[PDB]
């Protein structure tokens, strides 16, 4: 047997770190940090403090309004009956405006709340993007997080905003609800002739699977060399240690090639980012360019053919 470094067996405590000092113009952080013993079994025990300037304050306000408009309409849809709200929660949703209204602002009683929730969540997310940018700037760090976040925002924007406007109707955006947004996902594939045959859907899957592949590989690799301090990747990158050396040789010996302690995080960065880049393109092309992905795949010679063992007379021909 051996220690697997999954749980911290013996936690130590020190007075909470208030954070690296930020340049003038940043607001003071807020909150008195607390320690969670149980969070400390799997990771860092400190919770807080937090930074909250104008960007994040504006972001949270937009976001609370958006979330409440959704919940209010969910509760209204079971006539304020809290017990039925809990019964039906996973089924409830806030529905996009009917197609008859196009891209015009629809009535409060029939779609106006969705558009307001969509506007304010979108602004809330865009302000959160600025927050990720500013927090790196104040620490003197490069902008990799905000670049990756922008890729996720791109996909989010394509789903609910760019494509509906291109298609001339808010009715083609996504409803706010757990199971309702799953209906939207399945119905979208049905309507557009089977999303499996969308090549950017295929790529997005390759990269989503690859993210789990790469984090399983990297996550597992680092814990196996954490006995050599391999989790301390900053100093393994500047001052290659036997942690970084043994990690590369494990993979070199397994599959014939390897990366570095720094560059695995580039592979990881791009794999995750390409998941949502290709997803946005795939949705951006659906309805706007390709109306039936299967027939598009047939046209370019991709669709498999099978021996005919079932077949049906088309009653519309007869």
């Amino acid at each position: 047997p051996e220690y697997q470094n999954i749980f911290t067996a013996v936690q130590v405590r020190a007075p909470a770190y208030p954070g690296v000092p930020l340049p003038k113009g940043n607001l003071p952080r807020i909150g008195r940090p607390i320690f969670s013993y149980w969070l400390g079994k799997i990771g860092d025990a400190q919770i807080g403090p937090i930074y909250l300037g104008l960007t994040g304050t504006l972001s949270i306000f937009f976001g609370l309004v958006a979330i409440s408009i959704i919940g209010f309409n969910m509760l209204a849809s079971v006539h304020w009956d809290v017990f039925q709200f809990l019964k039906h929660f996973f089924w409830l949703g806030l529905e996009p405006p009917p197609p008859q209204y196009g891209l015009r602002i629809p009535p409060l009683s029939e779609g106006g709340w969705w558009l307001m929730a969509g506007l304010f969540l979108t602004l809330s997310i865009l302000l959160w993007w600025v927050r990720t940018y500013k927090r790196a700037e104040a620490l003197g760090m490069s902008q990799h997080l905000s670049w990756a976040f922008a890729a996720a925002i791109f996909f989010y924007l394509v789903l609910g905003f760019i494509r509906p406007v291109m298609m001339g109707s808010w009715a083609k955006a996504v409803p706010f609800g757990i199971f309702p947004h799953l209906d939207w996902t399945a119905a979208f594939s049905i309507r557009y002739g089977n999303l499996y045959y969308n090549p950017f859907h295929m790529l997005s899957i390759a990269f989503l699977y690859g993210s789990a592949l790469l984090f399983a590989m990297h996550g597992a690799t680092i814990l196996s060399v954490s006995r050599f301090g391999g989790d301390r990747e900053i100093d393994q990158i500047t001052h290659r240690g036997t942690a970084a050396e043994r990690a590369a040789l494990f993979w070199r010996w397994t599959m014939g090639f390897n990366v570095t302690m720094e560059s695995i995080h580039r592979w990881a960065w791009w794999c995750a980012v390409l998941t949502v880049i290709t997803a946005g393109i795939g949705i951006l092309l659906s309805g706007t360019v390709v109306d039936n992905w299967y027939l598009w795949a047939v046209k370019h010679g991709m669709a498999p053919a099978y021996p005919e063992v079932v077949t049906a007379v088309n009653p519309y021909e007869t």
Binding site: I30, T57, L58, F61, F62, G112, L115
Partner: protein, 57 residues
């Protein structure tokens, strides 16, 4: 009736954070109120007043 020692509130709440939160709250409220009214009979953009401009074409 306003209190004469009300100014001491700025000994309790941080003046800078108050200013930041009011600005944030009012930008949200302003957008929210404009949008609610646009989704009702009071809408002034699609009311075809003084005319409908999509009909001149």
């Amino acid at each position: 009736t306003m209190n004469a020692n009300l100014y001491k509130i700025w000994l309790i709440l941080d003046p800078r954070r108050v200013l930041v939160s009011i600005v944030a709250f009012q930008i949200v409220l302003g957008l929210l109120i404009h949008m609610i009214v646009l989704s009702t009979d009071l809408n002034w953009l699609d009311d075809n007043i003084p005319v409908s401009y999509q009909a001149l074409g």
